[PDB]
């Protein structure tokens, strides 16, 4: 019945901002601005920013190779504070960067019954070869992987335990520091460990391109041409606040 | 075999809608075989044209090992084929395992090779009076002989080895009705070797004749104590056999008739 | 309704706003009147230049669904804002998931969790003064794929029968279906009569919960049965006498609050103590706040913790209510904020206005499909589950005509994008299914096969399994291993029975070509 810029949904994002009380009304109807009325019959004018009507992309370059750390040399700080632990259901695993892949059963902060090997240190993804398809799956889902092989024996076929140990980027774990996000695993012995990590977060390759450029949108409260030379977690609360205390102050 | 032909084409006409139904109903790969293996009447359809396609390969196997010869072999084939239907539907409910396609599928080849045995045994007596004699007779006959004898003894220590390791629950049927068929293949072996000696020797050898009557009635009484070994292990086990009691009593009558007649000569 | 509508239309138009926002909400939705996009676009702008909580919302919805007028996130988003700030709970509701799940704007917690605080706080005094009424979510995908089961609403003839069993003189028949009349749903409409003459039936045999349900409607008052707190005083102490839970939380409820006797906190806390002792919902959730209050008692923040988990299980919407507002003021336990827009989600789902997506379901049913689907849109504006996967597969199947043929699948496909990010199977493997044939977007193996993976390890879907055995023998976005294909179909035949017959022929045709390729390699 009528288009739908998706493009615009997924890449634009607003946020609406009413001011105290400037004057338009009488201006340029340049299809930026729209006309609403409050609750109280008070009239307002919300002007729209640039990417409203035409959208454009923004004029990012496209990301380079990091010029200081490499990927292994922002994955280095990690050997200083291996074996992060984490208990999923009925088993923990600890991984010893570097190290190993082990998985127990933890009780009263003991560890109880047999311990399993996942794996050891195999060999890391080098980012220099983008011939393998493997690069270009690494750098479409943003994600560094490493393999750990030649592990427990597997009580289905036999084959030893593997464990595939990825890590993404996250400013929230800046505070809380490392550690590990999703345990995966069919009912083979295959493991999946998904870490996200501060420490990769600024290579803009592996850092997912926000590009929000959050464009706000201004509703400088409109007056009729005739009575304007006459008057010539706390911050969404306090945004709603003031969004609520100026509609009423120009309801008057 | 116009019939045979159109009733397989419509079959197959009758599966092909159901199988497109299905496509058509969801277009994808699992949920349609998911859908057919749920419904009930798209397997029965599906069922029914399995059943057309053994009954395609046992009419092109008669063809091949007898041919035609469309006569009381076909009234004894399906006289016989109601009896053993009746009785293999009997003894499948004789025990709680209902459905189970793989046990229906057991049970449609055991009627096959019956099927196969009797007309088997109608072609002996066919030739023992006056047959049209050559080697291709000869090939088929010991073609026929080999085949049933080797896939019934397989078929039988199958069956000996499931109730070693599992039990007597439903195999021992299998096994008693192969050792039965075992006891036909014997017969029709002796009777087909006795048929050759009395051939080639040009003059009657009447000598023989009687001790091919005498083979006969010992393999009679065989099969009769191999039934009545099988009722007392069907007393043994569960508490009273219904599908096999109307062959007792047939195998009783003919030993009986056997004997008195053994016993008036 | 229909003759209803006929007077609204004709005091519509140009005389006052109440007529015209009701006639426009009942165009723009296609219910009890002929569906009028246009119409109710022209009423929307004119509700919007004038002034209205609702006009506005609708002309938000109409710029942001891409109904009617051409598609602008810009001033959707003013509309609702608006909405929002002039008093309305559907603009609300349609900004706090506008902000939880990051469409349209910048993704955060905080104002999620303000405007749907706001929301659940709307409809938790709705409940309490009124009752609450029970919302029957009903999906189309597992209704289509899955035919032959009961639906929520109860059969008629289960109907018929329980009323056989009632007049016969059945008396958990007559409590059963007086709980139904006076809840709603489940194929009865809620009607206040039948429960309480089912209840007096009942009351008449020696039932607790039919006196005890008689004293609840007599102290909350109806419309029918007019509100008597001695009434209710006395029912609530005959139950209470037998040992009923709920009688037992109708007299603590009484002396909490003074109906029919003084204001007593300690009896109120023993009762309440013993209607939860018996697994009591409503009991639970009274022992809680009174803890969490501190109304006769200490506040300790532990127990009235455990009373509100055990309510919340049990499913009582004040339950979550509370929980959500102790993780976000962090009173009790630690302040989280996702857990506390989750549970302020859940509690806003059950509102009056959930029970559209009946009404919409109806008008699945009467083949007039336009109107389910733009029923199915505002609610999937709003944040359902159930209404997003409605209308991605009305969209889908190409039953709904208002949108252009050209455009079905892009729309089809980010409702199912959504629906996906709310934990369901059957919108991954949909977003697999459209990324792998074509639809909606370019072909894309690569994409088709990391939703397919997604599915099968957050959900473990046979489908799923299937699909991912399939592309791996394809050698379809992955290097084409028979290994791995043999590991997924042997997967997707122990992760369900009904895959045994796909998984076996599959395998077949794998063993098939195997076969073939060791007679071509070998001499």
């Not at chain 1, 996942?118 to 992987?145: M, N």
């Not at chain 2, 994808?28 to 397997?43: G, N």
């Not at chain 2, 073609?143 to 195999?171: K, N, W």
């Not at chain 3, 509102?351 to 919409?360: I, V």
């Amino acid at each position: 019945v009528g288009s739908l810029n998706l493009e615009e949904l997924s890449e634009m994002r607003y946020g609406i901002e009413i001011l105290p009380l400037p004057v338009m009304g009488g201006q340029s109807q340049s299809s930026d601005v729209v006309i609403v009325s409050s609750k109280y019959k008070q009239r307002y004018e919300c002007r729209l920013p640039a990417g409203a009507i035409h959208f454009q992309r923004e004029r990012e370059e496209e990301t380079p190779a990091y010029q200081g750390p490499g990927i292994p040399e922002l994955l280095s700080p990690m050997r200083d504070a291996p074996c992060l632990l984490k208990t999923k259901d009925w088993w923990t695993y600890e991984f010893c960067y570097g190290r190993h892949i082990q998985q127990y059963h933890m009780e009263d902060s003991e560890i109880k019954g047999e311990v399993l090997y996942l794996g050891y240190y195999q060999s890391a993804f080098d980012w220099d070869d983008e011939t393998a398809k493997a690069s270009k799956q690494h750098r479409l889902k943003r994600y560094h992987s490493q393999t750990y092989g030649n592990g427990s024996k597997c009580d289905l076929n036999g084959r030893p335990r593997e464990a595939e140990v990825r890590f993404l980027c996250d400013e929230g774990a800046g505070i809380s520091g490392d550690y590990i996000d999703r345990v995966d695993e069919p009912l083979s012995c295959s493991y999946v460990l998904t870490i996200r990590t501060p420490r990769l977060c600024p290579h803009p390759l592996l850092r997912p391109p926000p590009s929000a450029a959050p464009q706000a949108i201004l509703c400088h409260p409109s007056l009729q041409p005739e009575e304007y030379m006459a008057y010539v977690p706390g911050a969404e609360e306090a945004q709603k606040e003031r969004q609520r205390q100026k509609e009423l102050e120009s309801n008057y | 075999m116009f019939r045979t032909a159109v009733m397989m084409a419509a079959s197959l006409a009758l599966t092909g809608a159901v199988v497109a139904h299905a496509y058509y109903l969801k277009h994808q790969f699992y949920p349609t075989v998911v859908y057919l293996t749920k419904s009930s009447p798209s397997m029965a359809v599906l069922y029914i044209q399995a059943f057309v396609l053994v009954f395609l390969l046992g009419k092109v196997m008669g063809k091949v090992f007898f041919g035609q010869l469309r006569a009381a072999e076909m009234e004894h084939l399906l006289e016989r084929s109601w009896y053993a239907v009746t009785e293999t539907c009997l003894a499948f409910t004789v025990f709680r395992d209902d459905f189970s396609p793989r046990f229906v599928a057991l049970f449609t080849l055991l009627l096959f090779l019956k099927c196969f045995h009797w007309l088997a045994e109608d072609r002996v007596d066919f030739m023992e009076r006056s047959p049209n004699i050559s080697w291709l007779f000869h090939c088929r006959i010991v073609s026929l002989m080999f085949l049933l004898g080797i896939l019934d003894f397989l078929f039988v220590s199958h069956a000996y080895h499931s109730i070693l390791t599992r039990g007597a629950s439903v195999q021992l049927v299998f096994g008693f009705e192969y050792a039965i068929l075992m006891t036909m293949v014997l017969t029709i072996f002796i009777k087909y070797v006795l048929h050759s000696v009395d051939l080639q020797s040009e003059n009657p050898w009447d000598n023989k004749a009687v001790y091919m009557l005498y083979t006969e009635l010992f393999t009679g009484f065989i099969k009769v104590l191999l039934y009545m070994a099988f009722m007392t292990i069907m007393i043994k086990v569960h508490t009273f056999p219904l599908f096999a009691i109307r062959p007792m009593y047939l195998a009783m009558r003919q030993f009986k008739k056997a004997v008195t007649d053994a016993i008036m000569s | 309704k229909r003759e209803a509508y006929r007077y609204l239309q004709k005091a519509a138009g140009m005389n006052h706003t109440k007529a015209l926002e009701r006639v426009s909400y009942a165009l723009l939705f296609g219910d009890y009147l002929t569906q009028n996009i246009q119409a109710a676009k022209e009423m929307f702008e004119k509700l919007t230049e004038e002034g209205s909580p609702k006009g506005q919302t609708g002309l938000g919805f109409l710029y942001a669904s891409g109904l009617g007028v051409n598609s602008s996130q810009a001033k959707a988003l003013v509309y609702y804002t608006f909405g929002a700030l002039g008093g309305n709970l559907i603009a609300h509701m349609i900004l706090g998931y506008r902000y939880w799940a990051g469409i349209g704007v910048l993704q955060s917690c905080e104002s999620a969790l303000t405007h749907y605080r706001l929301v659940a706080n709307h409809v938790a005094s709705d409940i309490s003064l009124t009752g609450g009424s029970v919302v029957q979510r009903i999906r189309l995908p597992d209704e289509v794929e899955n035919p032959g089961m009961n639906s929520g609403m109860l059969e008629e003839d289960l109907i018929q029968y329980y009323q056989f069993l009632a007049e016969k003189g059945d008396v958990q028949a007559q409590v059963g279906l007086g709980q139904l009349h006076l809840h709603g749903g489940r194929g009865v409409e809620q009607n206040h009569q039948r429960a309480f003459d089912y209840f007096n039936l009942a009351a008449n045999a020696g039932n607790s919960h039919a006196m005890a349900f008689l004293g609840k409607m007599y102290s909350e008052g109806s419309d029918i049965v007019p509100q008597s707190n001695e009434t209710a005083l006395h029912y609530f102490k005959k139950a209470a006498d037998m040992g009923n839970p709920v009688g037992q939380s109708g007299l603590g409820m009484a002396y909490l609050y003074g109906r029919g006797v003084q204001v007593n906190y300690d009896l109120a806390l023993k009762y309440f103590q013993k209607a939860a002792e018996q697994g009591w919902v409503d009991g639970q959730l009274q022992l809680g706040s009174m803890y969490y209050n501190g109304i006769g008692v200490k506040r300790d923040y532990k127990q009235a913790l455990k009373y509100f988990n055990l309510a919340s299980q049990g499913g009582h919407i004040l339950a979550f209510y509370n929980l959500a507002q102790m993780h976000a003021s962090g009173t009790g336990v630690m302040r989280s904020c996702h857990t506390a827009v989750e549970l302020f989600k859940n509690v806003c789902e059950r509102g009056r206005w959930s029970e559209r997506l009946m009404t919409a379901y109806n008008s699945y049913k009467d083949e007039d499909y336009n109107a389910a689907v733009v029923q199915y849109l505002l609610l999937a504006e709003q944040g359902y589950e159930v209404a997003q996967s409605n209308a991605a597969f009305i969209l889908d199947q190409r039953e709904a005509t208002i949108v252009g043929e050209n455009e079905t699948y892009p729309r089809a496909l980010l409702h199912w994008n959504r629906a996906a990010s709310q934990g369901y199977t059957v919108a991954r493997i949909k977003l697999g299914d459209y990324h792998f044939y074509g639809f909606g977007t370019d072909v894309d193996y690569e994409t088709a096969f990391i939703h397919y993976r997604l599915a099968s390890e957050q959900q473990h879907s046979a489908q799923a399994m299937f699909n991912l055995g399939y592309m791996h023998e394809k050698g379809l976005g992955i290097k084409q291993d028979i290994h791995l294909a043999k590991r997924f179909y042997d997967m997707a035949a122990e992760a369900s029975p009904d895959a045994q017959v796909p998984v076996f022929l599959a395998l077949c045709k794998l063993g098939v070509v195997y076969f073939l390729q060791y007679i071509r390699e070998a001499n």
